[PDB]
């Protein structure tokens, strides 16, 4: 078992996909979502380790006979957790979601295919569906327990790297698998980038197809383009954003308090005074938790006005009056 | 600091009666509390009254507690055979320094004052072959448990060379038994002839001395 | 409901560290106290700490030798006593007091022994009656560890039988006395045999008591 | 409850007046929609989540709520758009000896995310000591068993709780209400209604080029300007009929 070392490459302008299924024409829409950062460092592989999934992954592969036939997603890729297997064979895109004890070396043989040794087990299935020259790009993300898969196929004549061009990525699939996916791996008989929560200024042409986009967080010129809602910026000085130094750390300072508030004497007391003679106790110079009280459900009613119990633990007061 | 004193040292009341124990503090509990615990021989201490006026979980209602200031009272309306054990009062609070205990009080079945049956056993010849001599003094079936035993070798008082083991109250005659073992070297044992133990007990008008001679 | 360390046996002059594990994040806000009790003795408070503050107070007697610490990661309060002596052989407990209830919990207790440790068979010495009713007994001396079961006539004789609790010697071994009072007329007309059994040493001694 | 059953529903007509009319439901609370308008509406999918909890825990089932069940068993998103129904099950899910079939998770390393289901039975480690699959102190079983006896009070009586979550994405509708589809009329001011998207306009045949996955053509003002007729996949514009000032 041997694996090729990984290289690095420039992402260029790839990673532009319709964030929604709504038709728009000749309008410079602005969106905020998990996009592939422009000019990002995309990992490069040659024909396969277990790549972390993080928060959405952009996959790309240059193929001419469908050498890469599918993908696998999952947290541990064992029977302990669920997993997802996608295989695009011939004209069928078989997608399944079960608990698989994946084989260490998944293999698919061929031209007629007759060898399929990917997983050793398959239990508790939950979903199933059936549907160089060509560059195939896909975008996989998991948001709110929904797995979204966008795709785009282009005709290219190059093997050096990602072509320096612009294109859209139409959606293909959206499923409610609801799987905490943190790892994935392709299937052999490519390039990988990681999405980030960016803001884009997509340009819809006449026929509702994206032609150009501007990564607002890339560089000052792109940010000015986004602020002006335009691609052409005339000579001048434009105010784009605000700059604020973020806090370096956190400082918490409380006095030389040493004791614990005697709240037992007003809660666990054997007897309580009459309501017309409501007993009052002043509490000062002490430290008292408050999540402890609210964690115990023995209280029939617990209503706070002007303060919330969760925010009560981290707070200081001069004196606390307990009336029983 | 705070000093806790329990009275009486040992309470002798018959079952079915009312038991009363007093716990006195050297200083009032300004920001502290008191608790009453019961412990039996060979058993871990059991808390009975928490907060000095509230019965713990599973405690029979016959137990109660009151008081304030520097004095507190633990009361048992009806005394039961299972209620005869050792009792303690402990002052405790949020501040760790407010953690002290009372010396403890014992509860035993009240019984007529029983004079101890006093016996003296010379060391066995087998034990003498081992180079050690143990003279045994037995106080059988005496009540109350409080007794005094003094070892006299040739009219010389012995201290620091004897160990006493006392059994619990008998379940039949409500009496106690005591065994005092005086251990000496064989050479020292042969250096003296008269060995005796004197017992002072409430059931004895005068102390009773049981004596023997080495060789007879 | 606290969990402490198991029973310990240590040499004189050594140190023993008794733990007290607390459940969940109910560690800092409460107050832990260590209290020991020697056998046949009263309750003796040793110390107390508050994990949230970390400052530990100790009884005046135990100053220096003992030290109380507390770790939040394991939610466990530890009390380590150094220069152990036979006087330190006692049952120790950790009691935790809460912020909102005057109901001090207790641990199951931990026995700490400081003396010579060995697996020795008991020596049974027949304490003969003095020459109406006379007493005769057996001394179970120099055995370790506990316990030993003593019966008379293999349990046939039970009336008047008093098996006093064992008392630890200064040598680290135990001394126990098991006596019985019988009519003086039965001293020579009835053979009395005390059977002493020691499971840890698996020693069975049947000693016949004969009047002198 | 920790294993709340989930059902996916699409491609079927569903009424919603039947459930509302019946009074057998102790709790019937809708968020993001009202039952009265629910009949005349469409959705991309419906997810029905069924489970059992005691009445006191019913409050835990609602958006932006906290609690043992809420934090470790079944969490609802703040943007939940659906109806929570609940009825008493003491008559069936109560045993004199204690109904222990239903279990609820009591410990988890973090609060459950919305629509996230776990059935892990690994012993929960409450302390630093690694619980190597052995139950013990600070090594607690993740689940706990409800008593659920008829003798218990109402606050502990079992209840069957269903959560219907309607998801309306930018995809063709597949769950619609019990409303018949009228005949389409074009080039005339009409009160259209497409998949519950009401409005008034002059539906006209359009030359727009919709993509196969597109359904609504929005406008600069977020007004649905082009729509896809579900029965006949053609794109129709929506122009406001006519308006203007009336000078005298
Ligand atoms: C003083 O406080 C103790 C214990 O304090 C407990 O913990 C605190 C942090 C707070 O949350 C208190 O509210 C809480 O009580 C009280 O002892 C407790 O008594 C109740 C009586 O209802 C016991 O409840 C039982 O719980 C079992 C299940 O475990 C049920 O089956 C029973 O039916 C019953 O409801 C509770 O277990 C018990 N707790 C302890 C540690 O003993 C005490 O009553 C209280 N006294 C006063 C005067 O306030
Ligand atoms: C990508 O990362 C590698 C090291 O991880 C670095 O050598 C290379 O210059 C990076 N490429 C770009 C375009 O930043
Ligand atoms: C839009 O579609 C028309 C229809 O033929 C075509 O002529 C035109 O080139 C297309 N433009 C774009 C930008 O796709
Ligand atoms: C819907 O049904 C009608 C009649 O059954 C049919 O004419 C029409 O073609 C159907 N719609 C589609 C999209 O096939």
Author numbering:
A (entry chain C): 21 to 67, 81 to 143, 152 to 172, 186 to 243, 262 to 396
B (entry chain K): 1 to 216
C (entry chain J): 3 to 133, 139 to 219
D (entry chain B): 347 to 594
What do the authors report?
Alpha-B.1.1.7, Beta-B.1.351, Gamma-P.1, and Delta-B.1.617.2 variants of SARS-CoV-2 express multiple mutations in the spike protein (S). The RBD mutations found in Alpha (N501Y), Beta (K417N, E484K, and N501Y), Gamma (K417T, E484K, and N501Y), and Delta (L452R and T478K) are located in or closely adjacent to the ACE2-interacting surface where they have the potential to modulate ACE2 interaction or disrupt the binding of neutralizing mAbs.
Both belong to the IgVH1-69 gene family, and we determined crystal structures of Fab/RBD complexes and cryo-EM Fab/S complexes for both (STAR Methods). The relatively high resolution (2.8 Å) of the Beta-49 Fab/S structure suggested that the complex is rather rigid. The N-linked glycan attached to residue 343 of the RBD also forms part of the epitope, the sugar becoming displaced from its usual position, twisting the sidechain of N343 into an unfavorable conformation. Despite the sequence variation between the two mAbs the RBD interactions are very similar and involve conserved residues. The Fab-bound S trimer shows all three RBDs in a down configuration, with the HC making interactions with two RBDs, causing the RBD to be translated/rotated toward the periphery of the trimer. The tight packing against the second RBD forms a secondary or quaternary epitope of some 210 Å2. The residues comprising the primary (but not the secondary) epitope are conserved between SARS-CoV-1 and -2, and we were able to show that both mAbs bind SARS-CoV-1 and -2 S to a similar degree.
